[PDB]
Amino acid sequence: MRECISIHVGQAGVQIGNACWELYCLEHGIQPDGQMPSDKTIGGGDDSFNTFFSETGAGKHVPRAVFVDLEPTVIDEVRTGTYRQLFHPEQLITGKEDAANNYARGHYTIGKEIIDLVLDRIRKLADQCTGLQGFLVFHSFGGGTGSGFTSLLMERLSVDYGKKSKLEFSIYPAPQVSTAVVEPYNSILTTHTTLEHSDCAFMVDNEAIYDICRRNLDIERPTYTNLNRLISQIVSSITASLRFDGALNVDLTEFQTNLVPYPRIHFPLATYAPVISAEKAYHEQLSVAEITNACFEPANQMVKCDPRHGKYMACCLLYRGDVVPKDVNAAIATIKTKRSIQFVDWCPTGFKVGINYQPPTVVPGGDLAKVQRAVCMLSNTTAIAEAWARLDHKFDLMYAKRAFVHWYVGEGMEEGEFSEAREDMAALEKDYEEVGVD
Amino acid sequence: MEVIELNKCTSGQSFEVILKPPSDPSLEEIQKKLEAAEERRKYQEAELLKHLAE
Amino acid sequence: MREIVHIQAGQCGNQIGAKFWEVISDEHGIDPTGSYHGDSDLQLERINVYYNEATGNKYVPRAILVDLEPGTMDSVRSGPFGQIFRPDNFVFGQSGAGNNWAKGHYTEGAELVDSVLDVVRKESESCDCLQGFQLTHSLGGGTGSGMGTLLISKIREEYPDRIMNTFSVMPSPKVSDTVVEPYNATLSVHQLVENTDETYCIDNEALYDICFRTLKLTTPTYGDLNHLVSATMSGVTTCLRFPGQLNADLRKLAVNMVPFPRLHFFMPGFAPLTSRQQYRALTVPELTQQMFDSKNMMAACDPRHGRYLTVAAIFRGRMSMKEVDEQMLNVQNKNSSYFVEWIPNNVKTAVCDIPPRGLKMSATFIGNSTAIQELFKRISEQFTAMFRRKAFLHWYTGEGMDEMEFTEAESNMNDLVSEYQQYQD
Amino acid sequence: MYTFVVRDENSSVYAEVSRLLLATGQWKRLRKDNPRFNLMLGERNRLPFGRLGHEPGLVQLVNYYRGADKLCRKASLVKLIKTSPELSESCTWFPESYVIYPTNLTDEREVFLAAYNRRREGREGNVWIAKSILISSEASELLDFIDEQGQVHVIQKYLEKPLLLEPGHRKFDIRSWVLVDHLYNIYLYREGVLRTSSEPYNSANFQDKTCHLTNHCIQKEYSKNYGRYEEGNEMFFEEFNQYLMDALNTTLENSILLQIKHIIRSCLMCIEPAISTKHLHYQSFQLFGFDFMVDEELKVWLIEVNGAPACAQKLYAELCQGIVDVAISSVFPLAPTSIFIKLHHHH
Numbered sequence A: 001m002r003e004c005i006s007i008h009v010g011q012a013g014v015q016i017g018n019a020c021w022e023l024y025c026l027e028h029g030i031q032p033d034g035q036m037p038s039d040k041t042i043g044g045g046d047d048s049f050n051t052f053f054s055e056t057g058a059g060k061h062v063p064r065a066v067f068v069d070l071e072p073t074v075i076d077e078v079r080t081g082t083y084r085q086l087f088h089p090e091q092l093i094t095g096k097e098d099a100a101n102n103y104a105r106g107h108y109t110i111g112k113e114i115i116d117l118v119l120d121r122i123r124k125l126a127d128q129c130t131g132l133q134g135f136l137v138f139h140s141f142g143g144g145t146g147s148g149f150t151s152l153l154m155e156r157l158s159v160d161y162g163k164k165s166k167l168e169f170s171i172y173p174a175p176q177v178s179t180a181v182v183e184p185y186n187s188i189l190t191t192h193t194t195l196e197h198s199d200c201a202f203m204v205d206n207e208a209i210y211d212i213c214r215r216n217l218d219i220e221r222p223t224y225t226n227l228n229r230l231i232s233q234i235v236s237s238i239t240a241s242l243r244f245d246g247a248l249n250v251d252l253t254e255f256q257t258n259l260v261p262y263p264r265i266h267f268p269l270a271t272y273a274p275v276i277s278a279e280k281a282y283h284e285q286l287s288v289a290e291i292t293n294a295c296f297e298p299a300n301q302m303v304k305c306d307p308r309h310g311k312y313m314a315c316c317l318l319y320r321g322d323v324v325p326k327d328v329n330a331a332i333a334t335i336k337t338k339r340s341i342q343f344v345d346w347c348p349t350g351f352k353v354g355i356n357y358q359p360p361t362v363v364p365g366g367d368l369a370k371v372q373r374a375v376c377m378l379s380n381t382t383a384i385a386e387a388w389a390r391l392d393h394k395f396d397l398m399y400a401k402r403a404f405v406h407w408y409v410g411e412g413m414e415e416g417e418f419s420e421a422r423e424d425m426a427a428l429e430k431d432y433e434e435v436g437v438d
Numbered sequence B: 001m002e003v004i005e006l007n008k009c010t011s012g013q014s015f016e017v018i019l020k021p022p023s024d025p026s027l028e029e030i031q032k033k034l035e036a037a038e039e040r041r042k043y044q045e046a047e048l049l050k051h052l053a054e
Numbered sequence C: 001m002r003e004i005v006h007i008q009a010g011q012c013g014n015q016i017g018a019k020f021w022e023v024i025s026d027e028h029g030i031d032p033t034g035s036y037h038g039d040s041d042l043q044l045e046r047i048n049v050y051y052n053e054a055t056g057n058k059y060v061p062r063a064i065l066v067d068l069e070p071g072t073m074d075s076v077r078s079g080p081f082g083q084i085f086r087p088d089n090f091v092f093g094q095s096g097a098g099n100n101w102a103k104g105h106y107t108e109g110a111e112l113v114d115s116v117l118d119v120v121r122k123e124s125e126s127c128d129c130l131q132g133f134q135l136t137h138s139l140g141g142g143t144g145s146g147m148g149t150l151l152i153s154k155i156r157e158e159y160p161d162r163i164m165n166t167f168s169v170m171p172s173p174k175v176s177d178t179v180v181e182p183y184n185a186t187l188s189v190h191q192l193v194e195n196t197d198e199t200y201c202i203d204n205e206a207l208y209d210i211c212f213r214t215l216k217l218t219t220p221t222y223g224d225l226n227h228l229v230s231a232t233m234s235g236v237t238t239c240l241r242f243p244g245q246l247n248a249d250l251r252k253l254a255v256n257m258v259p260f261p262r263l264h265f266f267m268p269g270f271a272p273l274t275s276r277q278q279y280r281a282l283t284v285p286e287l288t289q290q291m292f293d294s295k296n297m298m299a300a301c302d303p304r305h306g307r308y309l310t311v312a313a314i315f316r317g318r319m320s321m322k323e324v325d326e327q328m329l330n331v332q333n334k335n336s337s338y339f340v341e342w343i344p345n346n347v348k349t350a351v352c353d354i355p356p357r358g359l360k361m362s363a364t365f366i367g368n369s370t371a372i373q374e375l376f377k378r379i380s381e382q383f384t385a386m387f388r389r390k391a392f393l394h395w396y397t398g399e400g401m402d403e404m405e406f407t408e409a410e411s412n413m414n415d416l417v418s419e420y421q422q423y424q425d
Numbered sequence D: 001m002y003t004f005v006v007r008d009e010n011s012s013v014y015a016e017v018s019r020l021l022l023a024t025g026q027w028k029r030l031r032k033d034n035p036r037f038n039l040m041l042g043e044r045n046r047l048p049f050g051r052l053g054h055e056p057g058l059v060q061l062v063n064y065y066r067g068a069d070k071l072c073r074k075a076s077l078v079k080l081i082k083t084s085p086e087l088s089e090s091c092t093w094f095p096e097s098y099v100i101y102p103t104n105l106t107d108e109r110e111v112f113l114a115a116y117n118r119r120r121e122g123r124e125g126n127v128w129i130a131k132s133i134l135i136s137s138e139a140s141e142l143l144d145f146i147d148e149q150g151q152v153h154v155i156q157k158y159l160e161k162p163l164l165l166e167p168g169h170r171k172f173d174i175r176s177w178v179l180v181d182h183l184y185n186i187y188l189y190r191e192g193v194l195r196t197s198s199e200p201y202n203s204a205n206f207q208d209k210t211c212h213l214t215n216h217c218i219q220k221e222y223s224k225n226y227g228r229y230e231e232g233n234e235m236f237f238e239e240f241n242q243y244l245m246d247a248l249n250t251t252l253e254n255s256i257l258l259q260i261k262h263i264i265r266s267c268l269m270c271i272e273p274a275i276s277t278k279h280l281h282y283q284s285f286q287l288f289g290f291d292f293m294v295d296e297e298l299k300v301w302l303i304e305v306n307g308a309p310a311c312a313q314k315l316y317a318e319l320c321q322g323i324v325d326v327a328i329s330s331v332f333p334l335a336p337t338s339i340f341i342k343l344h345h346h347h
């Protein structure tokens, strides 16, 4: 049994982390007070859920998490929320004034004076691990803290924990739920200084989560609560293998091996289905072939793109529910004869498949409905580069006029780090095209 | 259409299917980046105060 | 706990500020004695942003009243809410400024500035974490213009990394006290260019034309103009005074509205504006057609003569947020020739559930528009029409100023016009 | 008030569409780099599809189906036909073709020689054509001509028995314009053209390519009888239909039109699961120009498919207006007797 330490940075990272650990508890049977009736080893044990929860002599199950925000308003929701008893105060770190959506401010100005503190709190969670696997980092692209402070924390974690792996859950900026104009800058700044420090990154485009809420859940104007309860469902499915008995994705190392053959291309696309409204009278339950066939629809991708005009490098299918291998293979055959799935000639055309028999848990009173089976597909497609193209294009439009650039230089950053960062994306985009197009 | 490495436990099972075969900055350097920008903030604020003194 | 420090200076500064505290104090359930009597916890959530909590559950505004004559401030202390302001926060002289920028900035004002900063420092020292400052004042007078900018220059010296925000009233010959108002305004504008992050331009002529033409006021008065500024000030500050994550911090707002350090002069707007057909409910489409209409803008500038660098909208009231987005996206998509295409998504919309007093719903417009150059063009034209003949210069040279400093203020603002011009293309 | 942008100044077709849109008073043109657009008339090469469908509140539409180059490229078309089971290698309406890469760079060189040596042995007609033009009956010259270049080429069977119009004894081809809207309905323009050759067909001299190539630019450049029989070497369906009835005692519908409507279906239906925008975040629609050949047995063969074709001068008005009815207005309705023929199919 090896431990996994989760790190939530910024508002988006913190709220999403609040919805995952809420979901983790309902899944593993943990109550708000940290008590777990099904755990027969009191204050000890090396079970599959112990990779995410430590135990106290009193029987409390404490998440292996650390929350970090440069302003206390968002983390204060955790200290008084439903699951306040789960964490102790050390795990929650808050500042006094934020980064004002300025990467330079979160990385340099404010980050420098708080970096040593975070590491020390993280070192305390590491001092409980008998064999720490790595870290799961949740943050946003647009926020000054989520972008600026994350890249700095990543640089430092590669120094204090060299051999340890580091995965990202990043939030792609979408104008429909953002009031910041400089989020392109931040996104492209953080992705540059973070690239060589992350082993595998799952981008969730708010635009995708937004339309999935409006279309499937019939929410006219979704709130962050709606978005986070869905995002944590995907996260739960991706982390399940680490928290349950199983043989696929049993530790963070298996994610890079099974999903990232080329290092810089460590952004797998995620697809999820089904997402059914809870307010529905009563839905006809989908089969294995129907939910699998849905994983190849742009409508339920975490990043809107067209995989048909890309080339897959790897592919995983995580099933949760009443599913058996006989049904999985059946659907795959039928899909290959219909769909357009072009692999790269230096990778096998295969699918690693995991199955967990416990169906997806739903938050009481949430928006999602209880389904008997559901799947999450992690596919490394060159089609995700479309996201980088859009983002890069917006960057070019502003930087051409140096718009807003003074706010970054005013916090000590050099104007050169802009182009240097943008040239790295230009290289990232070329690596995708060299691997996909003919 | 082959199914290899079938692993089964009580909570589930995982396997593989093959359709077709194929064909850092040290601690010293980060403290310098941080202290370098902090020096350009100090020089920009000094020039601001110098302007205000004039 | 993100506290703001309010400062009002001069005749215009204090009367407008006074009404401002009258307007928001009503929205937060604060009575003229400081006691709270609202009915919604949303009223107190962000109350410590503009108010200090004294003993007995009393809420004392975080405001500093400044003037070089006692007249105007005596009226505030005897006005409606005058009793609510901290007694020590009244800092005033007796000389007066004689509507002279030089007196407010170099001679009279200089003698009183140190003691006003003594009070600002006393308010900041109590703040758990200070966002920044906001100053209400006029630019055509002598105190709020001459001494006001002196305070900003000195505040930025003692707090160089805090946000400096101002509500500036621009003079107009149609609403003119003295003929030296262009001199005073041209001299302040250079200070605001250098030492302020955000400045809400408010042209008195626009306020006049709005009262005469739209509101149907036969003979408008300063009080009528101040009502609008109150409603407008109450509007732009909604982001900061209630639970809204859209434009929370002054620095965040500045970071999203100011693409360039010097172009930070905003055009504010308000809707509805109805004459006493006043009970009619106003639909979301109507709110948006007026909010962008020039006749609802208070800079007296035609936005269709320039381009929008950034735009912030705030909608207050129980309405369809889905319908808000739809109409906002409609305005952009039907007039995308007036929004610069080199700033993606330069139009942001915030929603607030608590409406202003006496309105089922309203909207507030905040626009960083290159058309604001039309304002600085009128001032620079009136300035030159006199400075070429050295007319009325003795009032200033007699206070220690040189014709050189006037020539520089001139050239410094003609440069500001040119700057707004290269970005309009 | 709908809005659109233009990114292809050289397009003679959509240039007219842009003129008709503004003549409606309900469409507004924007700069070619403004992303707040309802409709895009995109560039031919490297159209930025990845940036479409990401503007909130806007339903965006584009005039190029992403991935249609599979059908509008010489080597791509051949590869598509021989690999797609919907078309099979035994396809009867497409000339036997092979993809040949130059030796200075898969490749079907040896496969072509086998079928070539089989024809020279059986006394059959062994005349092939290379393109990406040379016509020769010797395998040595066709291959040697490709090596002298540096791009991919295609060698397919040359129809030695083409149908010849009389008087004249001249070759010709047929151009059919097909429009596909966002719902993937296949509309065929009721009006086609025949870009005819003004020179008599001669099968004993492939050196002079004036009587073998029916292109409008080659006939108007290397032909000495241009415009003799019909205006601009373009005979339309009415006249060509009357001719078929007078000489052969049959109609254009029965003899050729049925095969054309069948080819257009089998090609477009084949790639529908690959380019469809039925569940995409944006919508697509494209105009196509199919080039057919007809032999002396009244059998229709498919030559190539143009993804950015032009139109006959006489038919610019009627067709462009039709593109606005079924493709644009059906998505952005404004405030007949269709000039198309819907080719129903199973989606």
Ligand SMILES: Nc1nc2c(ncn2[C@@H]2O[C@H](COP(=O)(O)OP(=O)(O)OP(=O)(O)O)[C@@H](O)[C@H]2O)c(=O)[nH]1
Residues within 6 Å of the ligand: A009, A010, A011, A012, A013, A015, A016, A070, A098, A099, A100, A101, A102, A106, A140, A141, A142, A143, A144, A145, A146, A147, A171, A172, A173, A174, A177, A178, A179, A180, A183, A206, A209, A224, A227, A228, A231
């Ligand atoms: N999906 C999702 N996105 C969020 C959430 N909160 C913020 N965002 C997105 O994050 C982006 C802004 O980043 P923030 O997380 O608010 O910034 P921050 O980390 O708090 O850093 P500061 O700039 O200092 O405030 C916007 O594009 C939002 O759409 C959330 O709870 N869920």
Ligand SMILES: Nc1ncnc2c1ncn2[C@@H]1O[C@H](COP(=O)(O)OP(=O)(O)CP(=O)(O)O)[C@@H](O)[C@H]1O
Residues within 6 Å of the ligand: D095, D129, D131, D156, D157, D158, D159, D171, D172, D173, D212, D213, D214, D215, D291, D293, D303, D304, D306
């Ligand atoms: N296998 C074949 N049999 C008979 N004729 C052929 C042929 N292949 C090509 N041609 C002749 O070549 C001409 C078409 O050439 P092709 O279309 O390959 O070049 P191109 O694409 O530059 C012209 P366009 O795109 O305008 O149709 C036709 O007029 C046809 O007569």
Ligand SMILES: Nc1nc2c(ncn2[C@@H]2O[C@H](COP(=O)(O)OP(=O)(O)O)[C@@H](O)[C@H]2O)c(=O)[nH]1
Residues within 6 Å of the ligand: C009, C010, C011, C012, C013, C015, C016, C097, C098, C099, C138, C139, C140, C141, C142, C143, C144, C145, C146, C169, C170, C171, C172, C175, C176, C177, C181, C204, C207, C222, C223, C225, C226, C229
């Ligand atoms: N909107 C508004 N403008 C005013 C008011 N009082 C004065 N002004 C304007 O301010 C300018 C005079 O400035 P004033 O406040 O008298 O200067 P002071 O000496 O600093 O107080 C003139 O252009 C007036 O039009 C007022 O109550 N409301």
Ligand SMILES: CN(C)C(=O)c1ccc(F)cc1Br
Residues within 6 Å of the ligand: C174, C175, C176, C177, C208, C220, C221, C222, C225
């Ligand atoms: C002297 N003077 C400018 C005024 O009394 C005045 C005030 C307000 C107004 F709207 C119009 C006028 Br006029």
Ligand SMILES: [Ca+2]
Residues within 6 Å of the ligand: A039, A040, A041, A042, A043, A044, A045, A046, A047, A055
């Ligand atoms: Ca245990």
Ligand SMILES: [Ca+2]
Residues within 6 Å of the ligand: A158, A162, A164, A196, A197
């Ligand atoms: Ca590493």
Ligand SMILES: [Ca+2]
Residues within 6 Å of the ligand: C111
């Ligand atoms: Ca004195």
Ligand SMILES: [Mg+2]
Residues within 6 Å of the ligand: A010, A011, A071, A098, A143, A145
């Ligand atoms: Mg924040």
Ligand SMILES: [Mg+2]
Residues within 6 Å of the ligand: C011, C012, C141, C177
């Ligand atoms: Mg006065």
Ligand SMILES: [Mg+2]
Residues within 6 Å of the ligand: D306
């Ligand atoms: Mg061609």
